[PDB]
Structure formats: structure tokens, C-alpha cells
Amino acid sequence: AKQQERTYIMVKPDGVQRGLVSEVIRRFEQRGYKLVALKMKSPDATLLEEHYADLKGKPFFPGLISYMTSGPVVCMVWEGTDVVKQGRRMLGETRPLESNPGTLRGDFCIDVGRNIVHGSDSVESANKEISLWFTPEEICEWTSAQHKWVYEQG
Amino acid sequence: AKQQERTYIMVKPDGVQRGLVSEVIRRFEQRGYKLVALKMKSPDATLLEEHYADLKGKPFFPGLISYMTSGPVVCMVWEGTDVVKQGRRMLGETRPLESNPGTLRGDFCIDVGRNIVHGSDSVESANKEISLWFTPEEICEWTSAQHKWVYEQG
Amino acid sequence: AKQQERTYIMVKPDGVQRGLVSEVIRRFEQRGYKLVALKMKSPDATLLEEHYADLKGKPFFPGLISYMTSGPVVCMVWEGTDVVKQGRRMLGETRPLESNPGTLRGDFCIDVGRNIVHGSDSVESANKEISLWFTPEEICEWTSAQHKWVYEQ
Amino acid sequence: AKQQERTYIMVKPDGVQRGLVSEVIRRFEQRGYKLVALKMKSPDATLLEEHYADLKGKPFFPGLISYMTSGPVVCMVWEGTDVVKQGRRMLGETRPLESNPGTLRGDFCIDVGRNIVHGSDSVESANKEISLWFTPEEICEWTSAQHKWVYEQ
Amino acid sequence: AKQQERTYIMVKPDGVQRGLVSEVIRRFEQRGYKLVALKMKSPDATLLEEHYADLKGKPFFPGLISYMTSGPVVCMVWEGTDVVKQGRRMLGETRPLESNPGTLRGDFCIDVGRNIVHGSDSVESANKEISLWFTPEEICEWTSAQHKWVYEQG
Amino acid sequence: AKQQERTYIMVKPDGVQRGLVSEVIRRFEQRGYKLVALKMKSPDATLLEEHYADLKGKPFFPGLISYMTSGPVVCMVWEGTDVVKQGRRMLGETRPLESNPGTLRGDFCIDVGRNIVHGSDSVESANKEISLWFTPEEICEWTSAQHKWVYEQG
């Protein structure tokens, strides 16, 4: 079902350090998207290496892993129709320098290696990333009071 | 004259229900556009049938009318140069999933059937829409104190 | 009974002029109060003179009436528990210079004669102000979707 | 020793339902308090019955537990000087009708039974709430880059 | 003349460093107070020592001076009725731990030594501080288009 | 170096009059760009004519000069990677009617002549403008505590 589509959003160490946690949550919360999982974590290197498994072997991999463990991150799971595509459109382009005002990276970032937040690039990655960072017990399913005002009835 | 242009903006039932009336108003108010008519109303079906007259005969028509009578609406008239087109642009695309961050629909909506606000799509239709939801007596003309700083006549 | 309580809130001409209509509405709308009536209006002198009846004859009365008709106002009826008192508290003190930061007048005003907004001072005067500024047909009754989350039963 | 003080802040089910999670976090985040633990949870009746242990036997107790399990909550631990007392001051008074504008409850709540958020009332009370809601492994130790500018020195 | 009362407001080094410049300005700009002088500066010890002349005898004074030269400050002169006392009110109490929510210090500070901003305590201090930090040529006198809406003409 | 890049940003008289000074500063400040020079000034014709030299000879030139001496301006220098380009993008298109929501002009403006703000269009003109409006003694050198979180290690 469309409305049960989920995406993994993660505030990176720079996002936490710069006090942007609330702001990242705000963009999703005000949109009518539903937060079904959340936690602050000081991830281990091994958990991040699997997350960035696609980048293993590249010259910047070590630097990326150490940087991503230089501070704690905030893991989130958002649910709602097309939340994967809308999610990353709300974050902006990968590069803050190509991101427009109104987006998170366009509003708050400059360097690509300090882009404060991560969003799953597809439904496939989202389902994978959700299972990597969270256990099914951490997913809190609920119904919004505003559901019928956010979504069109069948 | 350019500056006398007017458009009809209406916060739909979902916008009122989700506590978005002030935000819709903020977008136009901070832009320098001038509010000249405003009211909350729970319109009759007869009035809504005339508003969506061109949609009469469609299979979703009866349901639309029931949805637009399921909660009150806030009716508005804003005046200023190119307000019709700028208003639409500020609302976003008709579909929230194609609307950009920074727009009302891009920031707060997901489903097209719950896109929170309506804006006249053209000057011709604006004049029609205004004459329909408001009497001439409800229009309140005034001159903004910021007029010479928002507009440049020499 | 308690939730049914209503108050009359009005953005004065200086409030409309200074672009503060959305900020006044927000204070109430984000608090969980329910907007049941709303309209922009250019009230005539007679209406305003009835509203400020007790002040007729004061040296500043004519000037007061001129000011209240120098631009449009935004009329509102908000509904909810203790909305009269909480409304007044949100607007701040009548004198902006005695209003705390966080209140509308504390955040946006200086002169008492330019205090952007009015709120009924009691349930009795709210009932009076509401029937003066609005007709019963302009009051739209509905049920907020967040009602069970704003109020305990 | 003073800067290590911690408090437990919890967004209740009405807070999440009304979209106020980010706003609660903001008040603490912008103040300079360090977020050291955070999670969304759907606690079971046993955990809540322990949290509200003093209220057992009250006629409203069963209803209170069902309400507190009617939707998920967001649990938090903030760290910083005098954070327990300031945290309470930022939330407002337990009763929203006694909370001033600028505080969380004063800005967003009306009923004491739907007062959107909870804060530990004392150091000793926080330490107990923290260990009850969080394992020590969920507490993340870190140094803020703005430390020398928030604290002296 | 009460409307022409001026006060000296300065964003301290922690304020600049924590990105709170726009927020301190917003509090006054928003209130209807008029910005008549503004500048970023890295004052030398002699100027600061004179600015804090009353605290000259205290044991912490030298440490206060070196802290005030550890980063730049944003100097401001605001104008309006009772601006000195209201300015102070808006900043909060000297001590952030005694400042209420809604005030600058109550919203953003914790330590009294990192209370992000300074405001003149009286008209006499204001006048002394203005002429110390600014020259009359830097004081830009102007009339606000909103004057007749912020103030009663009487 | 990329990060050392600077651009001149100026709040025009309409921006000051409309109380948008804090908003213009916020866009850059929250982005992570660094404020290194700031001042309110009532520039004389000679300076304004030098700033707008490219437009000398145009029929509207005198009127432009009159308008720019109509009220005070706020002069700023912002430092950071690609700040000239990103600054312009954050301001919006020259014409407010062609500016997107989320940009300064798209959010607050209507007329091209009342577009509240100016930003240098290139590095070359940025260097010229900064020297014109500010002396080197007015530029404040400092290091931001969020630097390692705004910019990549190296």
C-alpha cells in the first residue's frame, strides 16, 4: 500500500553538532509524514561500514567511516505516500551547492562532506537501511488523528 | 492597473482542520500582498456546485462536494501586482508530490485531494470567484503604509 | 460547557497595517483553540461607538473612533476552555510596556494606543462583544480532528 | 559536576499526534542543552504502571494507562547546568492554564490531562526516570563544538 | 523626547559564534524599534576597559576583558519609546538561569558569563555607551513608514 | 582558497523600511557562511554612483540614485566556499516575479525596483564592491567554532 511506504532518514554528526536535529524532524513532521521509529546512536564502525558497503574500496572510505563516528547520529523512519522521493527532495541535491533554498541542504549546508542528513535513495535501499539500523520491535506503528485530512479517502 | 489585480485564495477544509490558516495567510502577508476580504464560512452545496461548475458530470463530483462541505473554509481576496500567478506559484503545483520545498503544498501536503488551499488559476476566473464568494460590501479597500517600499512608482 | 467557552479577538488597524494578522491567528491556532468565526471588516463609527460606549465624552474618544476606522480590522471568535483568560494572557497586558516577551504586545508593540489587538476581558463581555460584531449565522460550528488529543474526557 | 546534570523529557502521545516533537526538541536544542539520549517507544502497561506507581488505585489510573498506551511517545535525556529546573521552566507549569506565553505548554496546550510533555521534577527524580526509560548503553557521550561559547570557560 | 530614546545593544562574542545575530536583531526590529547604528567590530582592550569602567576594581575584570577580545561583536543602537528598559526586558535577566522563556537569554543561554548580549542598564549608561562605541556620523537618522502605526500621534 | 571567498551583500532601503534586516542576515548566518564585516550607512551620491557606474548614462540612473539615498542601507561581507554564487541564489532572481518561494525575493518581494537586497554577481565585482563600501580595518578576522562541522576536513 502506498501510504505504508517508508524511508530511512539520518541526521549526520554535523547535523547534531550544529543543532539541526529539530529542523530536520520539522520538515517531515509538518508535511503530514509519520515518524514510526527514532533513536540517537553513537554508531560503531562496523554498522556504518555495512551502511556504506557500496563505497568499500574507494580511497575516501576510511575517512568517511572515521568521520561518521566522530560524533553521534539520529536515526529515523518516516512513513507515508511517496516519502522516499519526497524525502530526498526535501533534503535537496546530494551537493549543498546545487541545492535550492527551501531544502535542508540548500538552507543550511555548503560542503558535500558536511551535508547534515541522509535519505534513502530508493524503496529498495529504504527497506534495506531500515532493517540495518532498526529492529522490528523499534518500529512504533500508529494512526494519525489528521489521517483523513492528509490523505484522500477511497 | 497592475497593482489592482486580485485573486481568490481559499483554505480548504483540510487546511483549517490541520491548523494551517495562519501559515497560508503568512505567505501572502509577508510578500507585501494586501488582504482585502476575509471570512470563515461553511458554504452550502449550491454555492460549491457553482464554484466547481466546470467539473459537473465527472464521477468524483458528488464526493468532492461532500468533502468540501465536511468542514469550514477560510475565504480570502489578496490584491497586488501579478498576485494571481504569484499566488499559484506560492501554493505550489496542483499536486503536492510535484510541488517544491518552499511552497505551501510542497511543505505541508501529500495527496492532491488534500492540497489544503485553492488559488484562482487566472484573472478571469479570479474575478468570477470573487464575485461568487464575496459581496462588494465585504471587500475592504485600504492603502498599505509600506506601499512606496513594496512598489516603485517614481 | 467549558470547551464551549468563546472569546472575541480583533486585530486593530495597526495590526493589519503592520502585517501581523497571521501572527495573531497563529498564537491561538497553535494553542489548540478553535476558530469558529472570522471576517475582515471596515466597521462604521456607530458600531465602534457602541463598542466603546462607556468612554463617550472622554477627551480622546473622537480620536479613538477615528483611529479604529482608519483601516480595516480582523474579527474573530475563538472557542475552547478558559479561552477568555488564556486569550488575554496571550495578547499580554493592555499596556505593551508592561507586557512580557512571548506575548503578542510584548513581542510587537510599544504604545498602548497602538496595541494591535483586542481580547474580551470576561465571559460576560465576550458574549456581548460577539453578538455585537457577529451574527449567529457567521459562527461556523465544527469538530476539530485533534479534539480528543487537546481535551481529556 | 554541574554541567553533567541530566533530565528526562518525554513527549506524551498527544504531543506526537499534534506534530510537536520537533518543537519540544528545539526549545532544548537552541538553549545549549546537549541531547544525549533519544528514542520513540510504545511502552507496555507494566512500564507505565511503574512510572505512575504513586497513582495506583486512583479511579482514573486505568484510563491514564490506556491513554498513555494509545499512541507512541518520544523519550529524551538532556544534559547541562541546572537542566532539571530550567527544563521545567521551559515546559511551563504542569497545568497549561497556569503556563505563561513563551513556555511549551503555555504556547501549545489547554488541558492538564493533555499537557503534551513531561519533565523530571528533581535531580533524584530524573536519575530514576532515566534508568527506568533508558539503559545506560542508549546514552551517548559527546562533546559539543559550541561548549566554550555556551559555558565558561 | 520619549520617542527618541536610544539604547546600546551589543551581541557578545558567544552570540556571534553561536549564530544568534539575526535573532537578537529580530527581537527589536519586530517590536517596532528603529535601528539607527550598526557595526561588526573587534574592539581593543582600551575600549572594552572603558566600557566596563564600573567593574574596574573587580578580580574577574582582566578575565572579562580578554574574553571580550576573543571574538568579534556586533554593535547596535536602537531607538524608540522606553527602548532602554524594554531592551533589557527582552534580553531577560542578567543571569540566564533566572531568565524566562521568550526572552533571549531564557531561550538561548545557560551561563551568566555567556549571556550572548548586552543592553544599556539606563538612559545615562545608554548615552555614555553610544558616544563611546559610535560617532555621530555612524548614527543614521530616518523615519519609519510604520511610525504612525507603531506610535499614537496624539 | 575556495573557503576564503567573500561577497558583498546589501540590504536596500526598502529592506530596512520593511523590517527585513534580520531575515537577510539569517539566510546567510544559518547556512554556515561567516559574517566578517557589517554596518548601517547612509551613503552619499558619489559612492552610490561608483557602485552603479555600469548604469551611468541610463535614463533611470538619477532616479535610482535618489531612491538609494532615500533611506539607510545595511552593508555586509560574507565569507565561505562559493558564497558569491550561493548568495545570489538565496536572494532569488533579480526580478521578484521570477523568484521561487524559499528565496528572499520570492518570499518577500513584488517589484524589481523594490527587491530589498543586492548581492555581488561575481568574484571580480565582489572584490571591487567590498573595497568600495568597506576599509580593510572594518573587516573582522575570526574562526568559527562550527568550522570543522561546516567544512570537510581538507
Residue numbers in the entry:
A (entry chain D), B (entry chain E), E (entry chain B), F (entry chain F): 3 to 156
C (entry chain C), D (entry chain A): 3 to 155
Q: What sentences appear in the manuscript?
A:
Toxoplasma gondii is one of the most significant parasites that impacts human health, with estimates that as many as one third to one half of the human population are infected. At the Center for Structural Genomics of Infectious Diseases (CSGID), the first Toxoplasma Structural Genomics Pipeline was established. The enzymes selected from the TDR database as small and tractable for expression and crystallization included: phosphoglycerate mutase II (hereafter referred to as PGM), nucleotide diphosphate kinase (NDK), ribulose phosphate 3-epimerase (RPE), ribose-5-phosphate isomerase (RPI), and ornithine aminotransferase (OAT). The genes encoding these enzymes were cloned, proteins expressed and purified, crystallized, and crystal structures were determined.
In both structures, TgNDK forms a hexamer with an average BSA of ~18,900 Å2. Comparison of TgNDK with known crystal structures of homologs proteins suggests that the TgNDK hexamer is likely a biologically functional assembly. Crystal structure of TgNDK suggests that the protein forms a hexamer with conserved nucleotide binding sites. Pairwise structural alignment revealed that active site of TgNDK may undergo similar conformational changes as its closest homolog, humanNM23-H2 transcription factor. Additionally, TgNDK residue K60 is residue R58 in the human ortholog, offering different hydrogen-bond capacities to putative ligands.
